[PDB]
Design a protein around this ligand. Structure first.
Ligand SMILES: *Cc1cc2c(cc1C)nc1c(=O)[nH]c(=O)nc-1n2C[C@H](O)[C@H](O)[C@H](O)COP(=O)(O)OP(=O)(O)OC[C@H]1O[C@@H](n2cnc3c(N)ncnc32)[C@H](O)[C@@H]1O
Ligand SMILES: OC[C@@H](O)[C@@H](O)[C@H](O)[C@H](O)CO
Length: 414
């Protein structure tokens, strides 16, 4: 069989996707394989999941999708291969909630936290940030549990799958909450000064800007507001008259409910409703995560090259992330602005533009999203992460032979 990622721009070398049906099978398979990479739901856009020729590509799809809510402790134990859509549905039905979700819920929890996946909100950490414990099947088949408080915990959650197979994760939860989603159109870049930009991004619990980099300024602003919090007037852009899709010209029916209609957290945090279940997408993605104080300068750098960006762009999404404790989180150690690009699926045309964008963002210490397309050289990458050395030492300790290190990870650490 031919295995690809979700977008289909990456075809893996493996002629079979190993899907052990028991933990006993899994441990034995790992112990007996020379090199392993796990495939989650394939929502990466590069060779991060590629095991190389003769490497084993393994999935947790054949294992039970455990979602075990502890309502007294407000925690949930989840299989690595569980996706957020089922996780959310389950914890919500128990009166509890996550503090954030990605744009689309049909992604593996283990895969998501492995690369620094995040939503938006100035006080909201990455998805990895609620993880209090990870259970790993290590290179020899044995289980290692690492929990918050361990000196190694900082490299254990966002690990690029390079420590071993995450078989379970435990996550902290809060009481279930309701949210409204208010959409606005045409937020000008002109006059968007440091103070106004801060106001706009803090205007609701989670806020995204979208643009096509065509007409100056921003096409859409999405305020995802918690109904248990104040919402002030938003004078900066016009309220949307119709239901919007972040990509101009795409079906708004796919999207979560707008016009300020209250609904549960897990039906408002994603941009796409649970019913929207694409088996592939005709897109590429890149994303660059920078110190939040550089947001306006970075936005102005994009604006000044927007004729270059636009022709290969579906939409650009601007978000915020609170500083991450995970050593390889692109949000590590600093409050962060994120600039994401959903490109047309045309690798040959997009790569030149990616290199050009990267050159423009270089002075802003832009860290690329590990799951997305980037061309930043390995040496520059290492210079961007203060605690990368400590990650490398943790991987060496837990995986001395580099069973879980592929070409992608090797380049990173080199
Ligand atoms: C396709 C897509 C991606 C996406 C998104 C929306 C869509 C439709 N929305 C995002 C968002 O709102 N915010 C954000 O920061 N990122 C967003 N993305 C990207 C996506 O979340 C990430 O690329 C994510 O890492 C993808 O996870 P997935 O599980 O789908 O991808 P994978 O290629 O198969 O795996 C990613 C890495 O994780 C390792 N992995 C997977 N499972 C395990 C286990 N159980 N144990 C150890 N490692 C694991 C893989 O080996 C690979 O390194
Ligand atoms: O990080 C991924 C998100 O930016 C992405 O899924 C967008 O929200 C989407 O492409 C908008 O249509």
């Amino acid at each position: 069989i031919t295995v690809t990622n979700w977008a289909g721009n990456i075809t893996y070398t493996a002629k079979e996707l190993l899907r052990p049906h028991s933990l006993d099978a899994l441990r034995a398979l790992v112990a007996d394989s020379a090199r392993v990479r796990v495939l989650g739901s394939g929502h990466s856009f590069n060779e991060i999941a590629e095991p190389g020729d003769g490497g084993v590509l393994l999935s947790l799809a054949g294992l039970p999708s455990v979602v075990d809510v502890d309502t007294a402790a407000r925690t949930v134990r989840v299989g690595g291969g569980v996706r957020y859509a089922e996780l959310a549905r389950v914890v919500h039905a128990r009166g509890l909630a996550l503090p954030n979700m990605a744009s689309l819920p049909h992604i593996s929890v283990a895969g998501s936290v492995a690369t620094g996946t995040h939503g938006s909100g100035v006080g909201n950490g990455s998805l990895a940030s609620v993880v209090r414990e990870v259970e790993l099947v290590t290179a020899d088949g044995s289980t290692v549990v690492i929990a918050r408080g361990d000196e190694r915990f900082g490299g254990a959650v966002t690990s690029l799958g390079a420590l071993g197979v995450v078989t379970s994760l435990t996550l902290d939860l809060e009481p279930a909450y309701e949210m409204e989603q208010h959409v606005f159109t045409e937020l000008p870049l002109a006059g968007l000064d440091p103070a106004t930009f801060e106001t706009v991004m803090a205007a609701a619990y989670s806020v995204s800007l979208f643009t096509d980099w065509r007409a100056p300024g921003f096409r859409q602003v999405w305020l995802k507001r918690r109904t248990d919090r104040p919402l002030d007037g938003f004078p900066y852009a016009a309220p949307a008259a119709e239901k919007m899709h972040p990509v101009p010209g795409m079906p708004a029916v796919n999207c979560t409910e707008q016009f300020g209609v209250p609904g549960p957290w897990h039906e408002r945090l994603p941009h796409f409703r649970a019913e929207f279940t694409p088996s592939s997408g005709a897109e590429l993605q890149s994303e660059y995560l920078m110190p939040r104080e550089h947001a306006l300068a970075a936005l102005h750098a994009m604006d000044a090259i927007r004729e270059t960006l636009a022709p290969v762009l579906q939409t650009c999404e601007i978000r915020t992330v609170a500083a991450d404790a995970q050593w390889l989180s692109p949000a590590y150690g600093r409050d962060t602005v994120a600039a994401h690009f959903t490109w047309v699926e045309d690798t040959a045309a997009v790569l030149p533009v990616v290199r050009r964008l990267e050159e423009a963002l270089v002075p802003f210490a832009a860290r690329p999203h590990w799951g997305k397309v980037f061309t930043v050289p390995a040496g520059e990458l290492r210079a961007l992460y203060p605690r990368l050395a400590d990650f490398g030492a943790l991987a060496g300790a837990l995986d001395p032979a580099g069973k879980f290190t592929n070409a992608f990870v090797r380049g990173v650490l080199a």
